[PDB]
Structures are given as structure tokens and as C-alpha cells.
Amino acid sequence: LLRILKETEFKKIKVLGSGAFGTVYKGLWIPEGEKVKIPVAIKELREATSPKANKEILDEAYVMASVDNPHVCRLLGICLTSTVQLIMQLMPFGCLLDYVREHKDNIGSQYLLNWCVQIAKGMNYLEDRRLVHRDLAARNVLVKTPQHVKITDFGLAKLLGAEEKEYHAEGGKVPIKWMALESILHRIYTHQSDVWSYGVTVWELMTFGSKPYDGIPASEISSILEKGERLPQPPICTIDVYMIMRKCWMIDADSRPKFRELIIEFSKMARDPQRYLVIQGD
Numbered sequence: 001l002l003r004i005l006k007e008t009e010f011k012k013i014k015v016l017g018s019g020a021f022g023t024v025y026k027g028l029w030i031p032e033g034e035k036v037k038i039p040v041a042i043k044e045l046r047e048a049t050s051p052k053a054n055k056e057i058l059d060e061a062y063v064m065a066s067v068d069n070p071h072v073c074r075l076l077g078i079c080l081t082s083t084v085q086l087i088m089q090l091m092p093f094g095c096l097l098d099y100v101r102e103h104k105d106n107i108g109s110q111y112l113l114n115w116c117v118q119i120a121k122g123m124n125y126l127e128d129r130r131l132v133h134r135d136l137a138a139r140n141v142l143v144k145t146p147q148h149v150k151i152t153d154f155g156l157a158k159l160l161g162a163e164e165k166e167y168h169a170e171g172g173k174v175p176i177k178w179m180a181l182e183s184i185l186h187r188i189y190t191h192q193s194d195v196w197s198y199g200v201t202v203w204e205l206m207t208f209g210s211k212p213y214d215g216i217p218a219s220e221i222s223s224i225l226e227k228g229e230r231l232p233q234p235p236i237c238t239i240d241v242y243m244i245m246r247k248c249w250m251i252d253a254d255s256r257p258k259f260r261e262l263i264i265e266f267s268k269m270a271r272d273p274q275r276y277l278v279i280q281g282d
């Protein structure tokens with residue numbers, strides 16, 4: 001169901017950001033035969049070197065165009081010229097990581113707990129679609145409004161077949177500081193490995209954008225996890241919230257809570273935000 005867009009249908013206004021993948025522009029999309037102006041993000045990728053790389057781009061686009069959930073960022077279309085341009089709905093505030101870093105003073109406990117609910121709802125939706133994200137992190141959650149965030153970036157996602165519960169990677173593409181231990185040791189990725197990355201993502205939100213295992217090299221993360229050491233308790237978290245993060249980091253993947261449980265646990269805490277998160281001027 002991939003919608004193909006022509007160059008005349010959209011126009012680039014200004015640059016939003018960039019990366020090794022390419023450049024993202026703030027754009028305006030006018031569908032062919034219409035007059036409505038839709039604000040869009042235009043992700044113009046670098047030229048692919050290999051046909052394998054070109055398929056990986058298209059595979060990511062098919063996945064991103066197929067997800068339909070209020071807390072998952074969908075692909076609106078694709079334009080093929082000298083390069084590949086991916087058109088998505090504009091998220092005006094950007095990634096949740098930079099948002100919590102640049103608004104640390106103005107973020108309440110209700111906002112942090114609601115984000116945990118929304119991210120856990122989107123992941124639970126992806127789990128029902130038999131998708132393993134494999135790259136969940138605060139840098140890959142986009143902020144439509146401060147009350148509404150969405151999961152994006154399916155460049156590492158994998159679809160599970162009829163009777164398979166795991167994905168066996170052929171290499172290392174995920175940042176190790178978000179990887180579950182079984183992924184570090186056996187390249188196994190499951191929904192419960194996404195729960196590990198979810199607990200890291202929550203830790204990023206509760207520390208207002210700190211780097212996990214800051215100053216520790218990537219080659220020594222496995223050594224840390226083998227000794228039983230985890231991410232420290234953020235100063236704003238009560239014992240209830242922090243133990244939820246610790247269960248996401250248990251060695252037995254089935255001992256970790258599932259996303260559908262995290263929805264109820266964080267919805268309960270969102271009803272009394274100041275009971276579970278103590279912020280200075282909340």
C-alpha cells in the first residue's frame with residue numbers, strides 16, 4: 001500500500017535536521033488534484049550504493065506505511081527521483097530526546113508518565129502486528145504536541161513469521177546501550193528485548209536526556225550487565241517507578257513485564273503523578 005508521490009505535489013520549506021541517512025526538510029504537500037496544504041516532513045536519503053541497500057530502504061517504507069496507530073508515526077508516501085524521499089506527517093516539536101533536554105524545567109510528572117503510557121501503547125500495537133522494533137529509544141520518539149508522542153524509525157524492524165517468536169540478527173547494528181543482554185550475547189531479538197529498550201527509553205525521560213552508561217565504552221557494557229549492575233535510579237523516580245525499570249532489565253526475557261502490563265501500570269501512576277515522580281516545581 002505504498003503511495004507514490006511526484007515532485008510537483010510537495011515543496012521544501014526549510015531544513016529541520018539531518019544525519020548519516022540524509023536530510024529532513026519541513027515541507028508542504030498538496031495531493032494531486034487537490035488544494036489542501038498538508039504540513040509534512042520530507043526525509044531525503046543519500047543515494048544507495050548497493051541493491052541490497054535499496055531494498056532495505058523500500059522494506060522500511062513498506063513497514064512504516066502499514067502501521068496505523070495514534071502513537072506510531074506513519075509514512076504518507078514516497079518520491080523516487082535521483083534519490084529516495086520519504087514523506088511523513090510533520091511532528092513540529094521533534095524527537096522526545098531533545099525535547100526533554102531543552103524543556104527540563106517546564107516538564108511535569110504528568111507529562112513524563114503520559115509519554116510512558118503512549119510509548120507502551122504504540123509498542124503493544126507493534127507487538128500485535130508481530131513487529132519487533134529493535135531500535136526503541138528516546139531519539140526515535142517524535143513529539144506531535146507535548147501531550148502526544150509517536151514512535152518512528154523502522155530501519156531495523158523485523159516481522160515475525162507464523163510460528164517464530166525470535167529474530168536472529170546477522171550482525172550488530174543496534175546501539176549496545178539499548179540492547180537486551182540476549183541480543184548482545186546471542187543476537188536474539190524479541191518483543192521482550194524491545195521491553196529492555198523501553199526501560200532504557202523511560203530512564204532517558206526520567207533523567208531528562210542523560211546518556212545511559214555515560215563515559216563507559218561500548219566494549220564494556222556486557223561486562224557491566226553480567227555483574228548485575230543496571231542504570232541508576234533517577235532522582236525524580238520513586239521506588240515504584242524505578243523497580244518497573246529494573247524488571248525491564250531482567251536477564252530472563254520472560255521475567256520482564258510485557259507492554260500490555262506497562263500500559264496499566266503507567267496509566268495507574270498517571271492518575272496521581274506526584275505520588276510516583278517528585279519534581280522540584282511540579
Ligand SMILES: *CCC(=O)Nc1cc(-c2c(-c3ccc(N4CCN(C)CC4)cc3)[nH]c3nccc(Cl)c23)ccc1C
Nearest residue numbers: 016017018024041089090091092093094095097098139
Ligand atoms: C532527536 C533525533 C532527531 O533530531 N530526529 C529528527 C527529527 C526530525 C523531525 C522533526 C523536527 C521537528 C522540530 C525540530 N526542531 C524544533 C525545535 N528546535 C529547537 C530545533 C528543531 C527538529 C526536527 N519533525 C519531524 N517530523 C516528522 C519526522 C521527523 Cl524525522 C521530524 C527531523 C530530523 C531529525 C534528525
